[PDB]
Amino acid sequence: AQGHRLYVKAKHLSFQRSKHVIHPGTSIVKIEGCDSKEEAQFYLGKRVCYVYKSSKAVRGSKIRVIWGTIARPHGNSGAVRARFVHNLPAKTFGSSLRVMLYPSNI
Amino acid sequence: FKRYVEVGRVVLVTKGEYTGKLAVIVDIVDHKRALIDSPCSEFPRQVIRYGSVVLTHIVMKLPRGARSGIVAKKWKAQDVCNKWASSAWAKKLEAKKVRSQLNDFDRFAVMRLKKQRREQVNVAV
Amino acid sequence: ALKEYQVVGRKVPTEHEPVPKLFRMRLFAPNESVAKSRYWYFLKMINKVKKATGEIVAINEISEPKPLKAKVFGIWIRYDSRSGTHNMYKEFRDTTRVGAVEAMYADMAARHRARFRSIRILKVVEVEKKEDVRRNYVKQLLNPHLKFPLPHRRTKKVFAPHRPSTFY
Amino acid sequence: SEFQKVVVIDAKGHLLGRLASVVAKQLLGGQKVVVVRCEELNISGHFFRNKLKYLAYLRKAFHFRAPSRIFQKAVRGMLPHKTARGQAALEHLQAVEGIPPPFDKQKRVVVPAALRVLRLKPGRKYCTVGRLSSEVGWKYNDIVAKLEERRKVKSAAFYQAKLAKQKKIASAKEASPVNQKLSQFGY
Amino acid sequence: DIYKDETLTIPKGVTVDIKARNVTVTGPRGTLKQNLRHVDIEMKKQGNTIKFIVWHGSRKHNACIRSVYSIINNMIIGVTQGFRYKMRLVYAHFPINIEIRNFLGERITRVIILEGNSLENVSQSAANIKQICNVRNKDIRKFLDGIYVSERGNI
RNA sequence: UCCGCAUAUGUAUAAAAAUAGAGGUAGGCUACUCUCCUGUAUCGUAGAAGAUGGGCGAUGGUUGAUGAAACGGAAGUGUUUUAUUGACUUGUCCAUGAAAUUCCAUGUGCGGAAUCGAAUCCAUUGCAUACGACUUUA
RNA sequence: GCGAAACCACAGCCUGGGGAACGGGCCAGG
RNA sequence: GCAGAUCUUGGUGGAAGUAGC
RNA sequence: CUGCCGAAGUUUCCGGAUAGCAGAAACUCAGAUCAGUUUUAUGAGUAUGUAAAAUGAGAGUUUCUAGUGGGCCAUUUUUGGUAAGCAGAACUGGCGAUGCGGGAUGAACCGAACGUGAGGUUAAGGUGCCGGAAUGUACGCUCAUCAGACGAAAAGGUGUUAGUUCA
RNA sequence: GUGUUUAUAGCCUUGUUGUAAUACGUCCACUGGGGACUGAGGACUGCGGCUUCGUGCCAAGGAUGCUGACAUAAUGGU
């Protein structure tokens, strides 16, 4: 089944936050394989999605997606800042996100 | 022991802008800094810290504080180039660099040949 | 990093002093502004020459003529501490005068918990004779047979699969 | 770098605090972590040092002695255990003494940022958690220190069988001309 | 000090393996396979020599290195000629039955060259014999008779 | 047992051991060489989500389905050995089909009954005892 | 069987600290 | 133009099916 | 209900007349003045003062007309001290009418003073985990069995690290 | 191991071989990409640049152009 997955695995770590104030509009995403802020420049502007399933079979489907884009790197270790169309729920801390390769400049 | 910080021992630079370039210690400034030089023109004579290099098993006899040109003469005389390359350590490094240069079409070709190689599966009963 | 500046200064000429004397010091500072301030402070406390009545006539950074040759530098320093009066002399082996002074500052700030303003250098000299070397550590570094293993090797990608070799 | 669903860590030679902080961050990152050989963890400091630390802890609570319970306590203090996120992250950690049968046949990784040989200065006294636990109440040290040889002997036999089996393909590799005919790609 | 090597001439012992900080210094008289885990000194088997490299060693490490050199010599001495430990016993007005018993008439019963490769163990055994012959609530002159090791020399 | 109702993306990787280093090494306890110097590796990876055929090379690698025997105790729950029965076989060479998606959007649960056991109450009992609740016996 | 009244800002497990009690109400823990 | 006035009037709670008769 | 302005919280005599702070009205006035500011030099005694330069701002008013007539944190200079702390003056600002980032938490400590938002960048603090951010680089000290991170203190250290002097 | 002076290595110093190169500092009204947020205003005027001149054109007093998906859905609110 290794003829698929055009995307890259990622994890939703947290929102942008200070010690005591959280900003849910921007989320901190750890793209796996990206290990520094210079490698995070490749994934800037790429589409990222959160894919989950819900009980109702609305649209005749069991899966729904929240889309987003990668805006800028966060820190030195390769984490990025992502803004989603809808703010990611706080329950999705440590959940998985998919980073496509489009819009591609390669 | 096989690797001693010594005058004339060949080292491999693993940190900095000269990563992956062979060099030979010419003097010991201190226990934390060593003076190295390489015959190739891309490597200027410089003082580097011991934490930025790894120590190779090749020892080639140099006088203390030898100049750059005489280092090159000794390097060519003792054929350090193609002596380091003969060891499997350099072959593994060279293969890693070559494998990193492969493009998508080359990667597809490698998968085809390695599948042609794997279908061999001949083992004596 | 530190830079070695030679600073020449003199007092403003007046009717009493048609032509004044030139006073030159070689002092280390990260930038020229620090060197000029240190030069005036040294002049004020050595020659009692005020900055208001004085002016800097020249300043030039000095590069090490032989940065590719190992050398031994002896530094005479003055320590200002709780007592405020100490004379010390240290010997450092390196390739440039700047590195030795930086090493001295790191050593004293670590061991003695000093500061840049308190520490003042009377002189830095190059020990060109092995017999002139006083410290035993530097004498070892000049022995004919430097032979020691690699120290402090210590060598994201967390969760390494195999145990490290951390050896030859 | 990359994550797996379950990560098995061989805690032999790993410092308690360094490994716990790495594990706690991985647990909050959304990963299931299994730490085996929890009795082989190391703590910087002499035997008497952490002895008085644990003896003072006994003076204070449910005093646990087992090495995994020591490690589980260290990881828990590095988690937001007062919230649902911290509790959920805690439940993804499985710390055990030794290597149980479900895990001795699975690959075990190590954390270089927590290894004693790469973090402690040579010549520094250290206290093993298993030895430290043995005198403070833990009574299963001897039986687990005896069973490990049985696991090691079986595992060593498996490695020899695997190595002997691998020799056939390794010889067959260079035997096939196509291995070197198109080896210009670095493979 | 950059280097503090301590060369020690190797004896005619059977084995001198010091792998994994375990100096299995075997010998003809005895196999003094004592692990060299006391000090972190690198041992170099330079033929008929044992260079105890103590490079970048501290004062405490150097003191341990010097003790290790004596231990190596002591192990070699035991591996070559052992260590005889002559023991002398003096009887008071009440002789001490020997399995120590009747110590000044003591009804309680406790438990002379002594050749041995392990000189430390032989000396420790001699101390145990001296510790066994311990006077309690008795004058020193009255308890002058006791078991004291006469001499200890290589057998 | 009947009746009614609601209807993760390759999930691939198993000696131990220390750095005052180990692993394994011919030979017959060695000797000495080799390897590291992380997995950027190894295993797998083609097919209108993976088609239909002609095949060919090898006459065999993957597996499904059963019939299986061994091993695995620490929490064995899995490691093989297979006997076959069928297939894909990317090992390789050809012929067809893919499209106007004509620029991204992706048996299981509940409520009822007819049943089979068991337990409590129960004949009970003080063994227990404000009452609960407990222990024996119908 | 009949049948009150007082009272009621509101919840309510402990160890320390929060300087003006801080506590029960905050912070750090069990 | 109300949330306060140990506010006024009316209605209704927890205490409580408690103290008790 | 919203918007705008906005104190004083204390000199002086002595419940007030005040003044002062904050507004309204009636003005005139840049070819003119004003200033919790720095100056030039000399006057007097580095400070202090002076008339006339730099910088900024347009300023001076006259009348009447609400509210207040305390303290706290203390700093600094400072007097007396007195086992020693401590107390007494002035000064300085802040809190008092002030939310916000940090300081584990915090009425007075470090930053910063506020319309509703988007993006960027910082301050003070920080980047092992809790916790956003380098288990960063380089050079040193220490192993504390009551480390360190925040008077029993004199000394003792066969506890040390570096150096200075005599040698 | 003792002393040597290029030996069958060379090291340092000195002037010196054709000049340099490089690093650092600084500047270009020199230039090539990647990402994100914003689109206020609403005829024409203006300042400019191209243009032989242009009811000319332009990145010049604030976004336009080309497409795709949906009414029994898409999108948001409670």
Nearest to E4, CA basis, from E41, E35, E37: E41
Tell me how far the alpha carbon of residue C128 is from its chain's centroid.
Answer: 18
Structure tokens, B31: 């226990």
Q: How far apart are CA A97 and CA A81, in angstroms?
A: 13
Whether the beta carbon of D63 falls within 7 A of nucleic chain G: the reply is no
Q: How far apart are CA B24 and CA B64, in angstroms?
A: 12
Q: How far apart are CA E55 and CA E41, in angstroms?
A: 8
Within 52-111 of chain B, which residues have Cβ less than 7 Å from strand F?
54, 57, 87-89, 92, 96, 99-100, 110-111
Residue B88, H or E segment: helix B88-100
Q: How far apart are CA E6 and CA B70, in angstroms?
A: 37
Burial of residue D124, with CB atoms counted within 10 A of its CB: 0-12 exposed, 13-18 middle, 19 or more buried: exposed
Burial of residue E17, with CB atoms counted within 10 A of its CB: 0-12 exposed, 13-18 middle, 19 or more buried: middle
Whether the beta carbon of C87 falls within 7 A of nucleic chain I: the reply is yes
To the nearest whole Å, the CA of A57 is away from the closest chain C CA by 40
Q: How far apart are CA E137 and CA E143, in angstroms?
A: 10
Of E1, E3, E56, which has the smallest distance from its Cβ to C147's Cβ? E3
CB atoms within 10 A of CB D78: 17
Q: How far apart are CA E92 and CA E143, in angstroms?
A: 7
DSSP string, D107-155: --BB-TTTBHHHHSPTT--EEEHHHHHHTTT---HHHHHHHHHHHHHHH
Of D107, D109, D117, which has the smallest distance from its Cβ to C166's Cβ? D117
Phi/psi for C60 (5° steps) reads: -150, 125
Domains in chain E, number: 2
Separation of A72 CA and F44 C1' (Å): 36
Whether the beta carbon of B119 falls within 7 A of nucleic chain F: the reply is yes
- Check if the beta carbon of residue D160 is closer than 8 Å to that of residue D78: no
Minimum Cα–Cα distance from E61: chain D residue: D123
To the nearest whole Å, the CA of C113 is away from the closest chain B CA by 23
Q: How far apart are CA A22 and CA A20, in angstroms?
A: 7
Nearest to E14, CA basis, from E24, E23, E26: E26
Q: How far apart are CA E36 and CA C31, in angstroms?
A: 55
C1' nearest to CA of B26: which nucleotide? J11
Q: How far apart are CA C56 and CA C46, in angstroms?
A: 16
Phi/psi for D96 (5° steps) reads: -140, 155
- Chains touching D (at least 3 CB pairs under 8 A) are A, B, C, E
Q: Is D187 on the interface with B (CB under 8 A)?
A: yes
Residue ranges of domains in chain D: 1-141, 142-187
Whole domain around residue E153: which residue ranges? 83-155
**Single-letter amino acid, residue D60:** K
DSSP string, chain E: -----EEE---S-S-EE-GGG-EEE--SS--EEE---SS--EEEE-SS-EEEE-TT--HHHHHHHHHHHHHHHHHHHHHHH--EEEEEE---SS--B---B-TTS-SS--------S-HHHHHHHHHHHHHHS--SS--TTTT---EEEEEEE--
Please count the residue pairs, one from chain B and one from chain C, whose beta carbons lie less than 8 angstroms apart.
54
- Check if the beta carbon of residue D73 is closer than 8 Å to that of residue D67: no
3-state secondary structure of C122: strand
Separation of C153 CA and F18 C1' (Å): 16
Structure tokens, C73: 């530098």
Chain B contacts to E (CB-CB under 8 A): 1, 31
Instruction: Write the CB contacts of D55 (distance below 8 Å, at least 6 apart in sequence).
Output: D136
Shared domain for E35 and E70, answered yes or no, is yes
- Check if the beta carbon of residue B55 is closer than 8 Å to that of residue B9: yes
Separation of B9 CA and F64 C1' (Å): 61
In terms of DSSP bridges, do strands E23-25 and E32-34 run parallel, antiparallel, or are they unpaired?
antiparallel
Separation of A68 CA and J65 C1' (Å): 25
Q: C157–A35: do the CB atoms touch at under 8 Å?
A: yes
Nucleotides of F strand lying within 7 Å of any protein CB atom: 7-22, 30, 34-47, 49-50, 57, 60-61, 72-79, 90-92, 105-106
Shared domain for E90 and E144, answered yes or no, is yes
Structure tokens, D77: 């203090």
Structure tokens, D140: 């299963």
Instruction: Write the CB contacts of E134 (distance below 8 Å, at least 6 apart in sequence).
Output: none
Nearest to D16, CA basis, from D145, D93, D126: D126
Q: How far is CA C48 from CA C11, C40, C43, D30, in A?
A: 11, 10, 6, 69
Domain boundary residue, one of E24, E54, E82: E82
Rounded (5°) CA angle D118-D23-A93 = 140
Phi/psi for E100 (5° steps) reads: -70, 135
Structure tokens, D93: 């950690």
Nucleotides of G strand lying within 7 Å of any protein CB atom: 29-30
Separation of B12 CA and J78 C1' (Å): 68
Phi/psi for B91 (5° steps) reads: -65, -40
**Alpha helix positions (H), chain D:** 16-28, 47-59, 67-77, 84-90, 101-104, 116-119, 129-134, 141-175, 178-181
In terms of DSSP bridges, do strands B22-28 and A79-84 run parallel, antiparallel, or are they unpaired?
unpaired
To the nearest whole Å, the CA of B124 is away from the closest chain C CA by 32
Of D22, D109, D117, which has the smallest distance from its Cβ to C161's Cβ? D109
- Check if the beta carbon of residue E30 is closer than 8 Å to that of residue E98: no
**Single-letter amino acid, residue D77:** G
Residue ranges of domains in chain A: 1-106
Q: In what order do the strands lie in the sheet with E50-53?
A: E6-8, E50-53, E42-45
Structure tokens, E47: 């033929």
